[model samples]
Every structure is written in C-alpha cells, then in structure tokens.
Target: SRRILLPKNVIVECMVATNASIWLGCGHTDRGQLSFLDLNTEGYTSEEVADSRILCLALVHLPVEKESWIVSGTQSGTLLVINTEDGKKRHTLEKMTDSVTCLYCNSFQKNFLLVGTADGKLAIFEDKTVKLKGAAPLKILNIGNVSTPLMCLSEVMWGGCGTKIFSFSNDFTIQKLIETRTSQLFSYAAFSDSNIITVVVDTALYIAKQNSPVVEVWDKKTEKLCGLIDCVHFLREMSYSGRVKTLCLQKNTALWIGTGGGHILLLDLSTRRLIRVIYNFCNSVRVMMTAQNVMLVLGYNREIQSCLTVW
Candidate 1:
C-alpha cells in the first residue's frame, strides 16, 4: 500500500495509532503543536484543531486500544497522553526535569509508560487514569554519562512486557535502567550491547543480549541495523506462539540485528551468537518488521517496500 505524502514544511516527529490508523505530527510550537491524520477506507484525511504540548520528539503506538496513544517525555519534560478518535489531548505528566527524547509503552500492568529523557533519565509510570488536568511525573533512572541524548525505548519481553527498558541513545548505546539519581548521564556503559550499539554510530548494525558482547564488523556503506529484538518478538508473539514462520522473527529471542545493506544477523538471548545472515536484499534495508512469517522491509528510499516471505 502507498502512503499519502505528509505536507511539506510540516515535518512529522513521531507517529502512532490504535483502533484506527493515525499519524501524528509536531508543529514545533511553543508547547509543541500536534495534528491528526486518519487512515480508513476514505484514505488519508487529517485535522489540526489544537496546540498539544507534545515536544518535537518520538511517540509510540499502544498494543491494544482504539485511537489511544500514550505520549510522554518532551524536550521540555512535558508529558502528553492523546486519543486520536476526537483528536483530543488526554493526559499531561507534569514538569520533567530534562527534555524527554524517547518513550516506550509497556503493557505488563494496565499499560505503563516507560520514558527515557535527555539526561539519560528513564522513568516508569504505572496504572492510573489519564486525566486532562495533569499527572504527577514518575521517577527517573540515571544510566550514566557520555550517552547520547536517548532516542528509542524498547523491550524484548513478551509483546512489550518485562521490567528492563532498553534505551537507544544518540551516542549509540543501549542503556539498562538503574534508578533515580540526580547526577548521572548514560555516556559510559561497559556492557556487551553497548559495544554492538556502537555499530549504528559507525553506520553499521549491532545488537547483544548475553553475558558477553558479540561484535560484528561495521561497514559504512548501505548498512544499518535492520531488525533487532522487538521486531522479532512482535513476529513470534503474533504468529500462534512461534509456530508460524511469522511467529519467529529470525533475529534473537533477546536480539535481532539488521543493517542498511540488506544484511541480517541474529543473536541468541542466552548464547549471544550471530546465528542468521542474509545479504541478498538488493537495496539498503531501512527498517524491518515480521508480518506472519515474512519480513516487511522499507528500502533506503523509503517510498518502496517489499516483504521477504521466509519466516
């Protein structure tokens, strides 16, 4: 399927959808501007009625819900919970210490929001009625210094369960959550995944999940981590308990690695070995997701996508 182009001058920062296919954008407003685009039989229709205080950052989709997406951790530390149906803002987490860069929604207990911020602050928010008035911010975990401004928050548990919140940092380190500390930055983590995470910075791909880190050589050309832990977990969780090819996403139970050049590698959660490898993608594999035993891929150009039907 083809996607309608987002308007020029209107850049999309993050996108999420639930009961319906919706796209969200940021106007980079004072409080952060938000807009809604609906995807139904009628095609891509959108509306912008309010200036939502959503920082120009990332957003995550909920596991199950109708047009509901929990938005947290803004560059200004403002949290926003939104419902796409009415295009209304639902929740606001009060003043964050630093700007929020990345957030992940964990559905373990009544939909918890895991937020990773600029200073490497990762906080956990549990079950609570998201009210428009406001919400008290959750505690922040201090990873270490020298970490890039945290970018993506992901988990390799059961369809987004598990206590560990894996954070993607700009400096290319996947951080493990520690605890709330005032003076800490996630710069220098000495874990194996930290070494593999460096490949993304080096223009290659990497992932790790065992006691020892397994490093893959980095190549600057057409190489980026293709699919890792979450993408594989999504495949197995949805495919009848890993029975269907779709059930197993060739990556790792805890690790999946892909690169921009159609190259693929897998790391075992327990042994940490690069189990699978494929280099026939033809073009740079910009992104990968498992859809029923096949891998859905977006090419480097992004407009064109293809699905590899090999579970």
Candidate 2:
C-alpha cells in the first residue's frame, strides 16, 4: 500500500479538479482552511476560509457562468459559495436549522442546489431566472426520523427534475427512495450506472434493480454475522462481529470493506466469496474509496493508504 500525506488535521471533504490536475481538500478546522496539491509543481498550497469549518463541499457549474462555483456547507448550518477562480467566499446562505452535513449542486434540471442538513432535512434551492443571485429553497423534503442522521443522499435520476430520492442514516437504516421501503444498511455506496445500488451489511452484500427489491443477498451465513475468515476469525477477532466501518463498492461485483480493526477485506460480491484480506499497519480504517484502480483507505494512522485492485 501507498500513503498520501495529509494536512495537519484530518480531511473533511475532498474533490478532484476535473478540468485541472489538482486535488482539493478541506481540513477540519473552524478557520475554514483548504489545502490543495498542485500536480504540476508537486507542491501544496493552503487557502484561508473566511468562516466556519466546512463539513461537506461540491462543485457547481452554472449554465451561463464561465467559472465553476465551490459550494461549501459549514458546521454552523450556513452555506458558503466560493469563486473557484480566486478562492473567495461570494455568498452566504443562512436558513438551515442544523449543521450542513452534505451539499450537491450538480443538478442538470432547473439548476437546483440540494442541501442535506444534519437533522435529515433536504432543501432544494433553485435559480429561477438565471440572475446568478441566491435565494431560499424552492422546496423542502422531510425524509428523516427522530433517530436518523442522514449521512449520504442521491438523486434517483441523472438528468431529469428529481422527484425520487434515497438516503442512508448513520444508524444503519436505508430509506429507499422517499422511504417507500426501509432496510438495514450496514454500509452502502451510490453509483451512477444503470440505476445501480449496492448495500453491504455485516451479513451480506446486496443489489437492486429499478422495478424490484431483494435482488441478492449472496450468503447463507448468519444474518447477524459477517462471513469472513482465512487470516482472522472475523466475527470475534475483529471489532464486534467484525462490524464494517466503511465500504467502497465496485457495482455489484466486488467490495472493499474496512473493519474496525486494521483488516481490509476484498470480498467478491458476485459469488459471496472471500477474495482476500488486507492487513493494515494502521489501527483502524475510517474511510474507503475506489479511485483509478486503487482503493484509497484513510486509516487511523492519520495517513491515506492505498492498495491496487485487480478489477
């Protein structure tokens, strides 16, 4: 595995400069510090944030504007818009009831800014007349229960005006498209291929199609246990029942599961087979993502660890 040096503090959010070759990351601090790596120079540059610490961020490309806007949601529940050209805060949105945990402004229809607050509230802000000015959300959707803290959300459609939505709570509950059906979500990753959905619980991995549910849970093992072995007796040796800390899915074929211990399991979702177990030098893995044929793992060692994946 390879390690990527991080800023002084942990990275709260990260995005790729699709047009450029740089990678931008927001550090966890109240001063709003952003660190980016210059691919051309192999140097790191830090930018000053004029406000609260950012919890989540996204890139917003306007229909008529030339430069893309960086939309940041802060821990103080305010939304800050930064001009990507000069890295300056341009606008502030102050109508949220809780911390802004997530932001998505890439809607192709109606140019809406989707905000997901900590309290399970989803607000959609619209730019009606292309004035380039900001306003309150045109509509709000209450999708969270009292105990639900929405961690991730996605639009069910690619290009249409979104009506169906899905969000998974921090408590391991999956709300299927506006809470039409709720299921257990140990971990999940939302992908944009042919309505693909992958949910890998402690017991098994699953997939669903557009018109049906309960597509596949490819294991006959205990429903409350994680089916793994070879290096460590997963259920008892790893953290409680080998509870999954994070997951990165490759469609419905394979999954990289980060456990509470330092073990990373590369499991084959298609056959419910144990492909391999990766031992990390770190204490535990906090996050996992697949990028450029490598599984990027953020371990408790405070370093970004990456392992090459075959598929």
Candidate 3:
C-alpha cells in the first residue's frame, strides 16, 4: 500500500476518486475545506468551499458542456458546484430545508444527480441543460419522515435505518423495503449486479446499547434477510476491537469492511467468509472508494491526521 499524508488538522469526512485525482471534503467547524490530491504528482490543493461542514462529495460529468464538476453538500443544507478544471464555485443550491447527508451521481447515465437530506428527502436533479443555472431538482420525494438521516443513495437503492429499493423513473416509487432490527446504521454496500445488499449496524454508537457489529445481507430477488455476518469474532481473531465504519463491494465477489480500528477485512461474497485481513492499514478507515478499477482507502493516522492509501 502507498500512503499520502494530508495537511495538519484536516479530518476527511467524504472522499471521491477520479482517474487522476482524489477529492476530499474535510469537517472543519469554521469553514469546511475541499481538497484535490493529484495521484501522480503527490501534490494537493485546498479551498474553502462551504461556510459550514461538508457532509458529502460527488463528481459529475456534463456531456453537453464537456466538463466535470464537484458537487459538495454542506451542513447548512446547501449544495455547491465547483468546476473541476479551475476549482471555482459555479453554483450554490439552497432549496432543501435540512442538512445534506449524501449525494449520488449516476455513472451510467451521467445526467441524474441524487441528493439526500437529513430529513429523509430524496431529490433528483438533471443536467440536460448547458449549465446548472437554475439549480433546481426535477423531483423531490419524501421517502422517510422520522428525522433519521439518509446514509447512502444510489440509482437503484438507498439505506439508513431502513433500506429501500426502487427503479428510476419520472414517478419513482419504492419497489421493496428491507428494514433491519438495528436502529443505527453506519454504512452499506451492494453488489454491481444488484443481487445482494449489505448494511453495517454498529449498536455501540448508542450509550446503553451494546452488541456485536453485524453485517446484514439481504437478497434482492427474494427480498429477505439472507445472512448475518458477525464481525466481533473476526475482529477478536485478529486481536482488534472496533466497530465497522464503512463497507465497499469489489467486483461482486469480495466485500471490503473498514473498521474503526483501522483494519480492513476482505470477505468472500460467495461463501460469506473472511478471506483475508489487512492489519493496521491506518488508525481508522473513514471511507473506501473504487475508481478506475483501483481501491482507495481514506483513513486517519495515530496522531489523528488524515491519509490516503491505494490498495
């Protein structure tokens, strides 16, 4: 693994990797920072893109304009679109009422932008026009109303305390609902074929609640809970103690589980067994993303400093 150090006091909350660069959103109190790290040069640049903390980051390519833009969601429920080439703010969308929790841009279509808010609202925006002039969404749907934030959003599925599967259309409706017994959901991952969905629930997040970290796997075709992978045993075998923080599916065969202890466990999807363990990858793995067939792990060091590693 190759490690790249980040600036001092920078806590990366969200990261998205391109072919040549990795975009990071830091959680700063005064003003959140947006950083771009060059893969080849090992150099980086930082910019204050939001007044509040940045919660999520996504990159979208506009075919009509032949340009790419970095879409950042902030704590104040604002969406800032930054030009990837010049690193300039192009638009600020403040149509939502709650803080932005997650952002998803469809890679296959490259036209739809899915925005999820803390109040459980899903808004879909289209970039058919030359510019993001209006900064309005095509449709805003109130998917959930319990005030629990939406953790992940995608073209076919979304999850929080509950998981919902739906198809994309003008009038999108929930096709299937998979609700887990756990109340707190940390992260989730799904296979490329959409055959399986896995959610990581960390009950330790609660004060009085205590349980082993469990990964609930659901079969999309049957719409039922198929398997439960308890991570406590796996962590104990490796002599580490931490909850699963994030998850990433690799080529529909392996599931990469990032732990708070900085260990990454690779599990075989076919047999639901632990394949290998990468010990001490970092102090804590915050995010894992795959771009251009490369898996990039964003994590913090022992000094609470941020670093990015390529696997």
Candidate 4:
C-alpha cells in the first residue's frame, strides 16, 4: 500500500488515462483543486482552481482536439471544462440550483455530457449544450432521491442509438436509464460490470451480460461464490454498518470493489476468484479505480487519504 498525504481535504474522484500514462484527481477543499501525476514521475502537480468545491470529474476528447479536456463539477452547481494541453479553462457551463453529483460523456453519442444532480435529476447536454447565454439540457428527468441521493454511474451501455445508464438508488436498488426513461431493477444488493461479466447483487454471486431488459442470473455454486462471499461475510462480522459502495472493473483483467466498511476486494474476472483483500481505510473505501494494473483507492474516516495498492 502506497500512501499519499493530502491536506485538510478529501479527494472525491480520480481519472486514469492509460494512453497518456498519467492520472488526474480532484477533491473537495475550500476551492476545487485539479491535480495530475505522470507514471514516469515521482511527484504530482496540483492546480488550485478557486471557484467552488469540486464534487465529480470527467475526461473529454474531441476528434479534432490534440489533447483531452478535464471536466469538473462543483458543490455550488457549476461545470468547468479545462484544457489539459495548456492547463486553462475552456469555458464554464450554466449553473444549477443543486450540486452536481456526477458528470458523464456519452461515447455512444459523440461525447455528450450526461449529468446527475443531488436533487435526484438527470440532464442530457449535447454538443451545443454549453453556451454563454445559459443553455439548457436536451432532456431532463426526476428520479426521486427520496432519501439522500448518493449517485454514481455504473456503466453507460448503449444499443441501437439508445443508451442505458445504471446507478444505485438511495435505498441500494439498481436504477437504469433507457432512452430517457428511468426504471428500477433488482433489490437490496449493489452491482457493477466488466465488458462481459456483469456482477450482480443478490445473496448469491452471478455473472451475465446485462444489455437486455432482463438478465438471466446463474446462482454461483457454494464453491464459486466462496471467495467473494467470504469478503462480504467479513463485512457482516465487523458489524460496521456499511454497504458495498462501488465496483470498478478493468475490462478483462479484474474486478475491484470498495466497501462502506473500509475494505477493498481485488478479484480475478476470469475465475470470480479473490486475489487480495486490503484493509486500508479507517471508515470506508469511498472510490477506487485500476488503470494500467495500478489501483488507486480513495478512503475516508476522520480525514480522507489516497493510496495506491500495487499488486
């Protein structure tokens, strides 16, 4: 486990660019700070963008642009797009009354922005969506955060010009967006995906393709689910009152899960086998990602800390 000391703030998100061999991270502070570290270097460079507290981040690349753009959402409900080539702000989008919880670029739609808000709303922003004259979303829908909404995108699955957006409801149920329609699927457990092996959240473990309206879940035998089940059981053993937070998959290699109980599980995608269980944080594994085989985990308790657990 490699620890990087962050000041009196918490890192809310991190994005890894495999092609650039570099990583970008943004966090909550008095002002949102954007930072990057190249894999070939030992140190990181941070940019103090004094606007608002950043809540989420995304990377955007246009076909004609040489370098990609770093997109950030603030707690004050503003969206900032920064050009990485010069480390400059390209432009700012219209502000909302509520904080932005997530920012997504639709690869299926030529990099359109799909936004989620703390107020249980989803907005679709197209290529011409950003304008100085205050442009609005192409489509908007309310999903009812009835409880406090902890929104994050699971995967952006697209088919026949329509996109499927998956996220967890405040009650830990699966919610999906189909062609501007939002529907709830599953109950009580959290799920995530690789390209082929979609992880389900039942008491049992199953893998299947989730592109269709209904997925056929095969109950993993006692032996197959042992590795993953054991880790989940350990959470119960702690009586720590935490749920499985998020799951990160590296296309074909592995599935990494962060728990509210402050543990990270690394499992082999090919076998549904547990490789290692890391007890790194004091409270919860807030967010994590594995790019280029290097796993970066963001954890929080009294304070937030970022760690790279290299296998």
Candidate 5:
C-alpha cells in the first residue's frame, strides 16, 4: 500500500480513478481545484475549476474522439467539462438550479452525463449526437427530486429520502421504495450483480443522537431485503464503534466499507459476513473506490488534509 498526501489547504470532496490516473475535486480552496495524480509517472498537478466548492466528479469517454473528459460538479450548481489529456476547459454548464451533489457517467452509455443536485433534482445531458462542433449537453430535462443525492447503478438509479431508499428507472420513474424503521439517512449506496447495499447513517451533528452504521442488503432479482448488517451490534465483541461513511463493491465478491473512525472493513458478499478489518487506515475515510482491480481509499489526516491510499 502507498499513501500520498494532498497539497495544503485542499480538502477532497470527491474522487474518481481511471486506468492511469486519479482525479480529485478539492472543496476547501478559494477556487475549487481539480487535482490529477498520475499513477505510472507519479506526477501530480492541479487546476482551478470552479469558484465554489466541488461536490462531485465523473469521467466521460467520447467514442468519436477517442478521448476522455473530466466532469466536475460545483456547490454553485455549475458543471465543467475538461479535457483529460491537456486539462483544458471544454465546456461550462449552468443549467442546474441547485448545488450539484453527484455526477455519474455510464460506461456503456458514453454520451450521456447524469447529474444530481443537492435539492434532489436529476438531470441528464447528452453530447456529440446533438451538436457536432463543441462539447455541450444538448438535451436538459428535470426528472424531479428524490429528496437527496442520487446514486447511479449500472441501469437503476437509487436515492434515499428520509428513511426510504427509492430505486428509479432510467426515465426517473420510481420502481420500488424500501422503507426502514430507523430515521437514519442514506449516506451512500452500491450494487453488485446480484445484491444492492445501502449504507444508512445518523446525520446528527451532535454525538448524542448518532447511531452506529447499518448496511441493508437487498436481492436485485427478488427485490427483497435479504440481510441487515448492524455494525456496532455485530462488532460489539470487538469493541468497534466506528460509523460507516462510504462503501464500494469489489468485483462482485467483497464489499469494502470505510468508516468515520478511519477503519476499513472487508465483507464477503457471498456469505454477507465480515472478512477482515483494517484499523487506523487514516483519520477518517471520505471516499472509497476501485479501478483497474486496485483499491483506492481517500481519507483525511489529523490536520484534516486529504490523503489517497492505494492497495
């Protein structure tokens, strides 16, 4: 494992790793900085992308040009697309009505950009087909709100509003809503070939109202909740009290869970059981992702500076 520290005063809000490089969206800078770290060359560079905080980042590939574009979402509801090779701003989109919270680009659908706003609005943008010259999203449509950040699966879209997890079709039609007893909000969600996992955490600022994280696993074929993993309850014997902040699926076999206490839990998807626990991974895990079969974990240290760990 290798740990790389980010520059001073730059806090990472979102990150995406491609085959050869890792892209970071820093939210704490005067102007939002898009940092790029090359894996093979071990070189790092950053560029100011937005005035407001960058909330999310996505990578889109243009088949016609045989190039990739970096799409960033800002707190001021702006979206910027930059060239991956030269790091030049290609397009600026200001169609969002609220702060952008999440961005997703489907691997199979290379031309469409799916954006989610903090106010719970979802927008889909298309390029190349409508306009030939510049890279601009031609079709802009409001698909309504899910009350919070929207997460994209391969085909289905998942959003958590209050205590319910709603799954939507590509057209933004609600397919099913899974309700939980607790009032904990959905922090993040991921899906595998067979199961979908939802991470529910208490969003209370005060420690008194906070609860240990819980992960609900649902069978995609049956559309039923198959298992519930209570973090504190299951790890009570180990005296674990960490709250899960993010998670990612590892090739449909293992689920990597990152915690607020800087711990990483490896869970077996086949049996839905905890496989291993890595303690003191960082100060606190902000994001977890995998690319090219390598696990990338992003977290902050004691001074609240960002660090990227590759495993």
Candidate 6:
C-alpha cells in the first residue's frame, strides 16, 4: 500500500542513452515544457521542466560519446536541444506543422530525425534542420482518427539491417457492422526481429515476419507495447511479455516493454521471453527508451527506473 502511493507524478516524456537518462512532462500543461532528470541522481529534482504546457518531449544523442546533447520535440512542435550533463539549452530547430505527435532519432546511415505530427503527417529531417527531399516524410492512412493524431510511436530493426516504424491511435475507426465497429485506439505496428512489418491490432499482434502472425496482445488497452526492435515477422512467431503498449530494443538487443496499464518488463531476445517485469516499479509503465545498449523505462510515477546491466 505504501509503495503504490509512491508515484504521485506522471512521466510525460523520456529518452535513454548509453550513459545518461532524460525525461520530460506530459498533458496539456505537462506537455508544455522539457527538462533533464538524471537517473544518476536516483530521483527527480525540481528541474525537469520550466513550462506548464509541454504535452510531449523526446531526446536524441548527438553522436559517439558518453557526453551527448539532448534533442527534444515538444507537443507544440518546438524542437530544442540541450546538454545532458548540465541541462543547458543548446539550440532550437523551428516551428513544425502542428503539435509534435512523436519524435525519433536513428544513428544508422548517419543520424536521421523522424517526426510525426498531430495532422496525420510524418517529417524526416536531416542535419537537424534540412528536410529530406524525394522522401514524402509523411503518410496519412486513417488508423483511428480522421481528426485523430498519433497517440504513440516506436521503432525496430530486423536482421540488424534496417528499421521499422510503428504508431498507435484510437482516433481512427473501422465499421465492423451497423452497430459494431473497430476503433484501433491503441494498436501497434513494427518491423519484427526477423524481417517483416508487424502490427498489433484489435486482439492480435500481426506480424508480416516473412508473413506470419507470431506475437500478439490478447487484451486490448491493458498494456503499452514498446520497443526499438527489428524483424517485424518475428511478432507472428512469438508472444510478447504480456499485453503491452510498446517495445524498445537496446543496442544490445534487450527488449524493454512499457505496459499499457503500467509496469516494466525486460525481455531477453535470445530467450525470446520476458526476463523480468520490474515488479517493484513506481508507477504504470507508459513510455520507454534505449540508447547505446542501455535501456530506460518511464511512466505515471515521479521515479526513474533503469536496468544497471542486462543482456
């Protein structure tokens, strides 16, 4: 009972690095700003943010070093970069199309910035400023909302080659019948660990892993499935660590899952099973991140959780 009352706050945003931790605020007012809460500190300080409307936030490493910079995309589409070590403001990109639905930075083929928006669009940015040409950078398919926005986002790569992007939404709806309808308010899309694009929809986690349905979420809206994964086809061949909201793979192949209802699960890819669900967690696992083979999970608590060392 005492432990359940520990997390009195909510983790609005988060990003993991090989050597450091970065998190931010959420909600209309929570999403109003950004800040850095070092896991090295063991807990949050009075310095996570300076704003009251930071709806969303995310961080990306500059490159090759324990010492790195933090790049955060806010709900207002304001992109800011700061120093992780000292929490200093470095730079700001510019105004985006709308609210920043989701932000992801990949270090493959050189660092690339992937930005999702509330207006059903995707933007690919390079060098932090230049938008890539010849690339659409945006896709609108009506997953849940006609006026629906990107509810969540994650990335995965397969066969250690390329990456697959996945997002969730409840804003879009599908008419199953006159009185029956399917609204994928919280489905997941991924590139399996093998080599296929996979998605968790309704009660099933669909894997195109060589074209099969492996891992699935039997209960909808019960957990958050998170991962920085690969091989979308693998989903059709495996069962995830329980119903989840998202799955993220550490550079070491450790799968970090953020529960939909809240909790943390560490998965060993070699074992293809959940290594452990951090039972003594502070709050429900809602968001997660991994960088440089290091993994960090975040949620409704005012706490910081990270795996010291995991395979």
Top-lDDT candidate index: 3
lDDT of each: 0.41, 0.50, 0.67, 0.52, 0.63, 0.42
| lDDT for residue 103 in candidate 5, whole number 0-100 | 82
Candidates in descending lDDT order: 3, 5, 4, 2, 6, 1
TM per prediction? 0.50, 0.64, 0.84, 0.64, 0.79, 0.52
Q: What value of lDDT does candidate 6 attain over all alpha carbons?
A: 0.42
Model 1: per-residue lDDT, tens digit, 182-227? 1123121332232111112222233332222223222223322233
Model 2 alpha-carbon miss at residue 96, Å: 1.3
Question: Where does model 4 exceed 4 Å of error?
Answer: 1-28, 127-135, 145-150, 156-242, 250-254, 267-275, 279-284, 292-294, 300-305
Question: Regarding lDDT, does 5 or 6 come out ahead?
Answer: 5
- Can you write out model 2's per-residue Cα lDDT over 1-311, one digit (the tens) per residue? 54554545455354434312333545555666655654334456777664666777766666575766676677677777767677544776555787776666534445666777767677766643222445577656676542344444433321101222354332223344432132344222221111222233323434332222123343323322132222235323333334355556765567666666676776675555677776754566655655455445655453443211222
List ranges where model 2 is wrong by over 4 Å.
8-28, 39-42, 105-112, 126-133, 145-147, 155-241, 290-295, 302-311
Off by over 4 Å in 1: 1-12, 26-42, 45-69, 89-91, 145-148, 156-311
- RMSD of candidate 2 to true structure, Å: 9.1
Residue ranges of candidate 5 with Cα displaced over 4 Å? 107-111, 127-147, 151-155, 170-172, 181-212, 219-224, 238-240
Error of 2 at 90 (Å): 2.3
The lDDT of model 3 is 0.67
RMSD of each: 11.9, 9.1, 6.2, 8.8, 6.5, 11.2
Each candidate's number of clashing pairs is: 22, 0, 0, 0, 0, 59
Writing each residue's lDDT as its tens digit, candidate 3 over 98-145 gives 888878775444467788787878887776531465467877878766
TM-score of candidate 6 to 2 decimals: 0.52
Tell me, by TM-score, which candidate is best.
3
